[PDB]
Amino acid sequence: EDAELLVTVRGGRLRGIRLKTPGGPVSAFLGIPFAEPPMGPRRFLPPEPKQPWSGVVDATTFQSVCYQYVDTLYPGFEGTEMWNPNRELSEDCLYLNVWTPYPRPTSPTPVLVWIYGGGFYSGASSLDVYDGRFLVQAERTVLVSMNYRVGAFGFLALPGSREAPGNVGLLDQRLALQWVQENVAAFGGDPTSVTLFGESAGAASVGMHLLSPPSRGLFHRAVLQSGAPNGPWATVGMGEARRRATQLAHLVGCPPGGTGGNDTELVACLRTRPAQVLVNHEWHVLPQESVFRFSFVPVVDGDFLSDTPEALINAGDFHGLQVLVGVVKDEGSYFLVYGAPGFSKDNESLISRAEFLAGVRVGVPQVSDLAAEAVVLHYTDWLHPEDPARLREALSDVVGDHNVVCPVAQLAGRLAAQGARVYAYVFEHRASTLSWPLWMGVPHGYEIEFIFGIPLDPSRNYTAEEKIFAQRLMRYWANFARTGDPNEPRDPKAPQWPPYTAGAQQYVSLDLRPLEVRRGLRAQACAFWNRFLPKLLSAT
Template sequence: MRHTVLVVFTLLFEYVICTGPLINVHEGQLKGKQFLSRNGRNFFAFQGIPYAKPPVGQLRFKAPEPIGPWKGVLNATSEPSMCIQKNLFLYQTSNVLLGSEDCLYLNVYTPKLPKIGVKNLPVMVWIPGGGFSSGHGGMRLYGPKYLMDKDVVLVTINYRIGILGFLSTEDDILPGNYGLKDQVLALRWVQDNISKFGGDNKKVTLFGESAGGASVGLHLLSPLSKGLFHKAILQSGSPFCSWAVLPPGLAERRAKAVATITGCPPNSEDMIDCLRLLPADTFVQLHRNFFEWEVHPSVTFSAVVEKCKDKKDSFLCNYPL
């Protein structure tokens, strides 16, 4: 009997190693892979999981829409594209672009898959920084190998940045805060699915650095984020930073400047129709036109206070101070 159990366990282990772990989430089935932590502990990685429809075409400059179900097994064994951006360290000297507009993906890392009778682990959701114009949740910047030595499930996310993530005319047509609404949808996905990875959706800590830290603080204030996380860690950024939320009128002026440069009409309805026809790289290349000291030289498109009357999808209704 002992030999039979050993053989079955060995075959099961080899199956997981060769085929990758399979998990069923609400949208379908995922295939992941295994890594080793810093101290040699096995953990499971599920990378490039879509949590929203690609924000392209008519979904550009719009709140994200949840991803629908997929057929078959989704291969979650490679990192997703980052949201389209320039290299932060070569911003003024290079026109090379990184990433794609189709970028609303997240990664889940867990040291333990769920088992009957075993408590699920606390969850940490990482929001990367980058001045709301660069950054991503990939392993190159934010690898999981340190945290996977601990009993915690880690989630890292991508969200829209720059003009594509934060353009606003401060009205109901182009309300802004799309990148922050991406984060909200990712948190909803975590609530719905993280138990499948051995995580406890009642023990979610949201943490981030720089613009990610400011984002965490804004989630503490947003009605959309209520109940989606339970603890917060802000690192090198807060909603009280001068650049975190633009003052009244500035976002609208910058949006109209974008329209002027691209040859689009200045009124919101015609502007959004025109801007949706332009290639995504246009907006990344335009970003450098707005480096100025009015608020902060490198954070030019960020959160805005929305018109919240009778609107259930408004992220921020009041200034932090």
């Protein structure tokens, strides 16, 4: 009863809240502090563990969202507002949430840990689409989700220095994983069966924890949804990260005119600026106009990432690891209304040939003109080279394959061929309540609502098929969290999900229809990005 809403952890006591679902109640503990507030002199520093507290911390509501840019491209539009912060912004944001079934599991239960995306510049665990009450009720697992510092507060890096080493947002996630190992048993969760799953930048974060030894021991399975650490947007070099941090300091008047600009005096000036001031100049440090590019992302520093993600993936041994990867059908369509010429969510975006050629330079930023010609060659239907509809779908494939599909396929192939058991999927169901235009198809990020069982919410207008389809996906994710295999171990009737291998390259399609096995995650398109295009740049 109400006694299950009281839980004692290593830091102190907590009071949770009961959440209602159409199938039964769920105990939730929202806003658990796992770190000291990274404010004042702690800005840009790695997180410190939350010191124990006296009394009962109220864990009945979500805590504050980390300071981040708020999207204003389409004010009042559900498709964009659903990702904006739904709580007040604050640097005091290092809090996590725990959903546990009712009654509380008496036996150790596998744990799912969600890491939200948002290009490492935005996101929050309090968003309605991340509501874990339906996944926990239907599958009786323990779900944990944490907040981590985004933007400059989480990834501004002056490499080599000590006042701003970078990757502190990744250390926020690692500390939350250490908190799960020390306290998830109090909620009925098994710390020996922890499955990380995230989307976009969260998926890239899950991949970077696979490549970091201090983080690898905190979990046992990984699910990467529409993201990978080896993408062209997930990491930056030490020289570029220093240029962006110095440019942001210049934009906010750091250092004051006539003062030396070493790393100590530069970060000290940054720590005196209000948090909103740094956010208002975050986008003004990118090197060129582009889409799917972000200012402050994880940096290859030799510490958290001893080498580039590509180098660590190639030289890595992943025996004893189960991975679930996948993408949506239209990964790049969402990002085209953020810079590609001739695109608009309120029309058909029937772009011309000239707009397609210009959009390639925005979708593939800062590459040689010869490299851009190779992209146009592969993504042009030369039997209909001027068809606006085909060009619109072509540029969507350019951005999606370059940033998501091919980095994921590259990762999935190296993982399976080096010990790991990999399962791959392609999400091909467009939600009936999707507010984005029809030409975007199945946009990036809109499989999350089905993984979290949002169609089960009675206050929403999802169809009856989508409710059954959502329960299938929650079954897939939970079975992978329990056994490392998305297939139901009791049911040979259901169509089987074959593992992904570097040779067969088998994957399944996720939609209202039963499972369908296909081969190749755009093998022809991803051979251009992963094999030839690097050689075309090496010769310049």
